[PDB]
Amino acid sequence: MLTLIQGKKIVNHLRSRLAFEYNGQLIKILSKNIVAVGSLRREEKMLNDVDLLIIVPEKKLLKHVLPNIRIKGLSFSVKVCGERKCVLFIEWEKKTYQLDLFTALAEEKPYAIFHFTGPVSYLIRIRAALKKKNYKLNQYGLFKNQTLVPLKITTEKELIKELGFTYRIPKKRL
Ligand SMILES: Nc1nc2c(ncn2[C@H]2C[C@H](O)[C@@H](COP(=O)(O)OP(=O)(O)OP(=O)(O)O)O2)c(=O)[nH]1
Numbered sequence: 001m002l003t004l005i006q007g008k009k010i011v012n013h014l015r016s017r018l019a020f021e022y023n024g025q026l027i028k029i030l031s032k033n034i035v036a037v038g039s040l041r042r043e044e045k046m047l048n049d050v051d052l053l054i055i056v057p058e059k060k061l062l063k064h065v066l067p068n069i070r071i072k073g074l075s076f077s078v079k080v081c082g083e084r085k086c087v088l089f090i091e092w093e094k095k096t097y098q099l100d101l102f103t104a105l106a107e108e109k110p111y112a113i114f115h116f117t118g119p120v121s122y123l124i125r126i127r128a129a130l131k132k133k134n135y136k137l138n139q140y141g142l143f144k145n146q147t148l149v150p151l152k153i154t155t156e157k158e159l160i161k162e163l164g165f166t167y168r169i170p171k172k173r174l
Contacts, residue, residue: 001046001047001048001049001097001098002046002047002048002049002050002097003045003046003047004040004043004044004045004046007036007038007039007040007047007050008040010050010090010097011031011036011040011050011052014050014052014071014090014099015029015030015031015034015036015052016030016031017071017072017073017074018030018034018069018071018072019069019070019071019072020064020065020067020068020069020070021067021068021069021070022061022064022065022067022068023064023067027064029054029065033054033055033056034052034053034054034055034101035052035053035055035113036050036051036052036053037051037052037053037113037116037117038050038051038116041116041117041170042117042118042170042171043171048098049097049098049099049100050097050098050099050100051099051100051101051102051116052099052100052101052102053101053102053104053112053113053116054101054102054103054104055104055105055106055108055109055112056103056104056105056106057105057106058106059105062103062104062105063103065103071090073092074090074091074092075090075091075092076088076089076090076091076099077089081100084102084103084104084139085100085102086100086101086102086103087099087100087101088100088101104139107140107141107150107151108139108140109154110151110153110154110155110156110158110159111137111138111139111141111151111159112139113156114156114159114160115139117156117170118168118169118170118171118173118174119170119173119174121173121174122168122170122173122174125174126163126165129165130163133164135163137163142163
């Protein structure tokens with residue numbers, strides 16, 4: 001559906017034109033809080049939908065995006081996915097596209113990004129490996145023998161290094 005260029009230009013527009021309403025007050029939202037994730041990050045020729053990870057330093061402000069969310073001069077629709085995932089649709093220039101958005105906290109920054117960074121297969125492999133190491137990775141933190149422990153990283157590299165693994169390129173899978 002979307003191409004590398006399309007994704008780049010639409011995301012750029014999307015991020016600089018996003019605004020949500022909280023308590024009747026309009027709060028504009030840029031890429032400062034939202035990071036484009038998908039094949040776009042993997043540097044792919046063509047992808048289906050553009051996904052956007054919205055990382056907020058406050059649980060409140062994060063949930064404040066839900067009451068009202070809009071775009072400047074654009075056609076959209078609001079859908080939900082699972083328990084923490086969200087799905088939106090956007091149309092412009094007589095064209096229609098799919099926009100997936102996930103709500104995450106500033107602490108769930110490295111984890112979320114690592115997840116959308118390359119292929120799910122790699123993640124599953126890591127999750128299974130940690131399971132053998134008696135560790136459990138989750139969107140909220142790392143579980144050491146049922147004991148939840150927070151993260152001391154912010155980078156994917158730092159995350160893999162902290163987890164005890166190596167970082168490979170998603171472009172060539174795993
Ligand atoms: N597609 C999708 N992605 C999710 C989900 N949960 C985590 N992710 C992971 C799976 C993929 O490895 C990675 C990329 O997800 P995206 O939703 O951003 O879409 P992307 O553009 O990468 O794939 P696409 O071109 O939209 O089909 O994110 C999910 O339930 N569905």
